[PDB]
Amino acid sequence: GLEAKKSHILAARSVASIIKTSLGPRGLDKILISPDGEITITNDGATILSQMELDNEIAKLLVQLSKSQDDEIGDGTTGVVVLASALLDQALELIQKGIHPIKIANGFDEAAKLAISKLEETCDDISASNDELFRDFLLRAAKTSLGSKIVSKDHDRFAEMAVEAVINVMDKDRKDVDFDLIKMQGRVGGSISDSKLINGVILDKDFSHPQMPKCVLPKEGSDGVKLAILTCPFEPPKPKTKHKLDISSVEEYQKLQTYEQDKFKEMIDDVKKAGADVVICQWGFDDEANHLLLQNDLPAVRWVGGQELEHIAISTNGRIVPRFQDLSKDKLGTCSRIYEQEFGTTKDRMLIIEQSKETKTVTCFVRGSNKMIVDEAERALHDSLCVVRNLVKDSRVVYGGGAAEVTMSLAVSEEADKQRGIDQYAFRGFAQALDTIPMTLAENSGLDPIGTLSTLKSKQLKEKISNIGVDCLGYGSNDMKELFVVDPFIGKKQQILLATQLCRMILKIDNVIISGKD
């Protein structure tokens, strides 16, 4: 009730002030050192906030909220934290004036709902303008985030990879994309020009013994290519009690020989009836185990993790056979083919498994000459896939980059005089808090934040109502509408809702209780 409200504002402001300079494409990077000794440098605020280990109870809400923001949007990492700090700074002045904290929390909710209806009138349509203009937004979606990196030279190649990947994994009914249906895999070595868009799981394999061919035979015009995965511990006859198997002398050579191999001869007949071309297991295989399957042209795969088996069954429509007796050919998956394609000069000799049909999952293939380039390309592609989902789910979009915050500011400030009572000042403080983002982008762009903010407000009133934002990166001129720079409306709408939800949870906690360390 006394020093708690003052300390929570200064504590949350000092933590949020770290990423204020990294907002935007011109935002400066940071050097993060992992406890294992690896140095990481990235502009994403999600990595910076996740690596923070601290006992401050106020800053813990930023880490828990940022985990859900990556799956829903992914671009609300730095933007929401900076916007949440603006609502706390405006609320600090109201505490000294005698304003109740819950009235400040309830005042931001009513002010946010009124600002959403204002942008609904000024938003523009994508599909109604043209069909091909929508695809042009997908090609330039990843260009903005990758424009500050060397990848910006080859960006035209990575633009077409996200167009076909989202359509397959997302249906127009629910218009949702699952994170578990996107396999992000990358390795060190090679270049970024060899990245290809694969419709199915990669599943790197050396084909065991080299005599096995690099391609799968159609098996007399059979339908697709059938695979068999086995998670069973396929292994010698280990009992539950005795074990203790040893060869006494040469006299036991022919005694134990014919007694063993005659077993598997029964189970191999059930596999040929189903037509499974390849066998996949979780653990390794023996040397002589794959030799008898070589004459039948039945390759085997070993050393496969448990998580990698998810993308194999979904993409290829395969399953894991419990028993070979009742196994039929109805539910066995069929793909186009399985071949081995060497990638660059790497001696690993990876392979490509295609489909040619629409699947429920995709696998992202990213390469690079440096370990940092690969990691920076994987995280930038994740945010690019979420923007495509927001454009399909909501056709109406608005122009961001400083143009949306100024429009929302003038709409709430104008309606503040029409709404009397205590909420009159709650709307004024909320409108001034929205001005922090365009001023932050102006400061991050190396320009006068106040001199630029006064310009954006003058062009949207005396001239005409339009969207003009602050340019962090050097461009030709203003009026981003001419450059066809679009931002998702539902993506920006999710940010302002989580910002008000985060600001309330901070003000609703007036007490800090923590034990000691022993």
């Binding site: 770290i18 300079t21 990294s22 011109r26 400066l28 990077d29 940071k30 050097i31 993060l32 050192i33 406890p35 000794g37 140095i39 440098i41 599909s127 303008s129 043209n130 069909d131 091909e132 695809r135 042009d136 090609l139 330039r140 035209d156 190649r157 633009a159 077409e160 359509i167 249906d171 127009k172 009914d173 629910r174 218009k175 629409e358 991050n444 190396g446 050097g474 001419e482 450059l483 066809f484």
Partner: protein
């Protein structure tokens, strides 16, 4: 502020360690250990930096940057660290006097680095003189690479095609200027050399086979069969025919973009996807040609040889960078349709057509050709030198002063300070050699300021003398390698606003 001070004062203190070791007359440094009996003395700059343990997290970044120069080339490693340290001395004076994000200053270094590379090109010389002796050695080395390769059947025919594919380039040696066309059902001895850009899968049916003064434009759009996946979208219609009407209304808006294509003054349009008959029929009246199956690789290789650019959108009409080709010939060979582009303005390129008997012989011949051309083209940037002795170092200094004429208000000090760092090289060399840096550099800049200056740094007489008479030259590849490495090294430290202290071990 300590985040930048650790990357400036901390880096300069470490940078000044190997700064005095630049050159054969430079200083030396001892590396002492705890037991002191394991120590050693050396002049290597990269060894001193890596051996000394440093708890500064900003100093560890410079170590990883210096490893790139050793793996890529491996020459002038110390000069990269010394030049990168001088860039921090000028950048520190620009920040403290500004306190604005350095990313704007970084943009000034990119514009200044372009003028430095262009100034070294005009004054660059080469050992390529008497090409008759170099051409005889080029064909002999190529025959050695052909060993163990299926191309070893005839060495004379294959090495002759590679000889005219190098010396006739007169430009970049990248493989993007060499097109590889491979077909089946042919002999390797029938291979020929062509300077045109060759496609396959000829475009159009009623389109003419001869095009005069053709223009090239790069764009990405789908004019045929839109709305790939219609499943999942709620369809409320009174009749079935209204479903196809919506697709026609979306393609109707493309008429404005098609009308802008004819306003560009181009007779040919290139698209990756297909085109419906209605927008394709309008291309005949407007004289527009539709090229298909451009893929991606072939798009980039065509825009570079023709002087064009690639863009997937239209920013504004009558503004773009376009190429041209005089004559396009459409022929057919090997039971496959072929395309031929010729008559490009300043076109420099070549195409080697290899005829194999199977798919296995084609992949082995293409990979063996790139390895053979990479070794032969390596000598183009090798042995080529430029005039040294501080001359070329000062030429880059006066070239930046030209950019200082037309410059922005806040970008002037960023560009002007870059020229001061270029003049720090003769200052360091004069101090390590035992001379007066203020006396030599002052008289060196006044002479090279305007015109007719062959003078350079002479360490034997302790004065400014002509380096062309003494025969003091330095490699041109070393010039670009150090400048490009030091420019990227300074960006890594400036783009980081806050540096967290590393975990002490």
């Amino acid at each position: 502020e300590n985040a930048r001070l650790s990357a400036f004062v901390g880096a300069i203190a470490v940078g000044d360690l190997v700064k005095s070791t630049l050159g054969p007359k430079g200083m030396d440094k001892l590396l002492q250990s705890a037991s002191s009996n394991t120590c050693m003395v050396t002049n290597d700059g990269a060894t001193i930096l890596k051996s000394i343990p440093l708890d500064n997290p900003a100093a560890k970044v410079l170590v990883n940057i210096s490893k790139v120069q050793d793996d890529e080339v491996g020459d002038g490693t110390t000069s990269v660290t010394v030049l990168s340290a001088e860039l921090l001395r000028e950048a520190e004076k620009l920040i403290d006097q500004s306190k604005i994000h350095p990313q704007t200053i970084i943009e000034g270094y990119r514009l200044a680095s372009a003028a430095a590379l262009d100034a070294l090109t005009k004054a660059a010389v080469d050992n390529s003189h008497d090409k008759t002796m170099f051409r005889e050695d080029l064909i002999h080395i190529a025959k050695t690479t052909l060993s163990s390769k299926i191309l070893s059947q005839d060495k004379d025919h294959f090495a002759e095609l590679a000889t005219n594919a190098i010396l006739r380039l007169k430009g970049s040696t990248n493989l993007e200027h060499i097109q590889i066309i491979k077909i089946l059902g042919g002999k390797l001895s029938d291979s020929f050399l062509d300077e045109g850009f060759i496609l396959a899968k000829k475009f159009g049916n009623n389109q003419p086979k001869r095009i005069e003064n053709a223009k090239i434009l790069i764009a990405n759009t789908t004019l045929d069969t839109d709305k790939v996946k219609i499943f999942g979208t709620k369809f409320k219609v009174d009749s079935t025919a209204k479903l196809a009407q919506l697709e026609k209304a979306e393609r109707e808006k493309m008429k404005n973009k098609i009308a802008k294509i004819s306003k560009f003054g181009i007779n040919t349009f290139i698209n990756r996807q297909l085109i419906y008959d209605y927008p394709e029929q309008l291309f005949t009246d407007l004289g527009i040609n539709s090229i298909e199956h451009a893929d991606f690789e072939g798009v980039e290789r065509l825009a570079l040889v023709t002087g064009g650019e690639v863009v997937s959108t239209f920013d504004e009409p009558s503004k773009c960078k376009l190429g041209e080709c005089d004559v396009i010939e459409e022929i057919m060979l090997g039971e496959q349709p072929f395309l031929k582009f010729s008559g490009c303005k300043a076109g420099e390129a070549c195409t080697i057509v290899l005829r194999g008997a199977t798919d296995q012989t084609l992949d082995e011949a293409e990979r063996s050709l790139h390895d053979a051309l990479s070794v032969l083209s390596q000598t183009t940037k090798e042995t080529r030198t430029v005039l040294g002795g501080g001359c070329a170092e000062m030429v880059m200094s006066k070239a930046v002063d030209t950019e200082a004429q037309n410059i922005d208000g806040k970008k002037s000090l960023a560009v002007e300070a870059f020229a001061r760092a270029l003049r720090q090289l003769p200052t360091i060399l004069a101090d390590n050699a035992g001379f007066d840096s203020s006396e030599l550099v002052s008289k060196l800049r006044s002479s090279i300021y305007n015109g007719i200056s062959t003078s350079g740094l002479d360490l034997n007489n302790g004065t400014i003398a002509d380096m062309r008479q003494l025969g003091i030259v330095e490699s041109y590849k070393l010039k670009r390698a150090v400048v490009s490495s030091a420019s990227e090294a300074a960006e890594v430290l400036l783009r980081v606003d806050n540096i967290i202290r590393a975990r002490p071990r």
